[PDB]
């Protein structure tokens, strides 16, 4: 039942969760969005 463990982790460690989300966005944009824009430009 790993859906409230994340809830407890966010409640107990808000700074760590915020850091993970911010860095995750920073990693997700070039890994996913950037190839999407590259592919769109070529066509």
């Amino acid at each position: 039942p790993v859906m409230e463990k994340l809830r407890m982790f966010v409640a107990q460690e808000p700074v760590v969760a915020a850091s993970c989300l911010i860095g995750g966005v920073g990693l997700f944009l070039p890994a996913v969005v950037r190839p999407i824009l590259d592919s769109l430009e070529a066509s």
Partner: protein, 324 residues
């Protein structure tokens, strides 16, 4: 080069006057918050209070205790004061108003901040007092701990600008001030500056009532004065850095002819004054952390968030090809 020392003195002497009056301003603001007056007898509105205090310290006999490290005991306040002074050679106040237009100015500032710890540690060991030594060790550890977050925030600004030139960092904010999209980064930077300056809520050296003796307890006369002047000059410098990196430096709030009328030095001074007011307002508002609590904050909160912001800003900028 014959005119260079004139410019250097035109920087240094007004800086010393500004420090002397920042101490007065802090006493006046804390007092007004507390329904009292603060210095108001020595000179009109207490305006001669800094002169009297400095002259008092000059005339006070220097103790120089019977330690076995007399040279290092006296050199420690000179080191920290010279370091506090030398950071202003690369600070720009307006377009073209800067002594040294260093292309590596950001890294130079980081180097100065890293060097600042030595005056405090040498004062502790050279003072032949276990209490001064343990306080100096704690202060040094706190300073190096918050240097990491300061450096990571500097890297974030560098990614936005793509140049270590402070004037270029200011001129990169013509479109928008970095404090608007990087507001949490600015808050983290202001707190890291507080902790780096040993300022409330992070002022361990002022926690004498907490059984925590400061690193400068064995200092009298002008060694103590040099430590104090260094710390307050660093407060002014941190306010200036907060202004330059996030509030557009000498730039006006809006790019309109009505704002462009008043000189950029006035804009820069106003912003620095606002951050100097925050340093005092925070000192007047809150209690202080324990050493373990602030160390935990430094390593467990501000470092992870600074690293996350470096990653997020760089990833977004390379993704949409918005790099300088």
């Amino acid at each position: 080069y014959i005119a260079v020392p004139a410019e250097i003195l035109g920087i240094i002497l007004p800086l010393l006057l500004g420090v002397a009056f920042l101490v007065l301003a802090e006493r006046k603001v804390m007092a007004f918050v507390q329904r009292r007056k603060g210095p108001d007898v020595v000179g009109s509105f207490g305006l001669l209070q800094p002169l009297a205090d400095g002259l008092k310290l000059i005339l006070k006999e220097p103790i120089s205790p019977s330690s076995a490290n007399f040279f290092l005991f006296r050199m420690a306040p000179v080191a920290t004061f010279m370091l506090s002074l030398v950071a202003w050679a690369v600070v720009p106040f307006d377009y073209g108003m800067v002594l040294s237009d260093l292309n590596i100015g950001l890294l130079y500032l980081f180097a100065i901040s890293s060097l600042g710890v030595y005056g405090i540690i040498i004062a502790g060991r050279s003072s032949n007092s276990k209490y001064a030594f343990l306080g100096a060790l704690r202060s040094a550890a706190q300073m190096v701990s918050y240097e990491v977050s300061i450096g990571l925030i500097l890297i974030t600004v560098l990614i936005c600008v793509g140049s270590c030139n402070l004037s270029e960092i200011v001129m990169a904010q013509k479109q928008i001030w970095f404090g608007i999209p990087l507001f949490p980064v600015l808050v983290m930077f202001f707190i890291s500056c507080l902790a780096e300056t040993n300022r409330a809520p992070f002022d361990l050296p002022e926690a004498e009532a907490e059984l925590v003796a400061g690193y400068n307890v064995e200092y009298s006369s002008m060694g103590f004065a040099l430590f104090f002047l260094g710390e307050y000059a660093n407060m002014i410098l941190m306010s200036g850095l907060c202004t330059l990196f996030f509030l557009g430096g000498w730039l006006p709030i809006l790019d309109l002819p009505i704002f462009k009328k008043i000189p950029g030095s006035i804009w820069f001074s106003i912003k620095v004054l606002f951050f100097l007011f925050l340093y005092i307002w925070v000192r007047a508002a809150f209690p202080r952390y324990r050493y373990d609590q602030l160390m935990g904050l430094g390593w467990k909160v501000f470092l992870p968030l600074s690293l996350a912001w470096v990653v997020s800003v760089s990833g977004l900028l390379v993704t949409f090809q918005w790099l300088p």
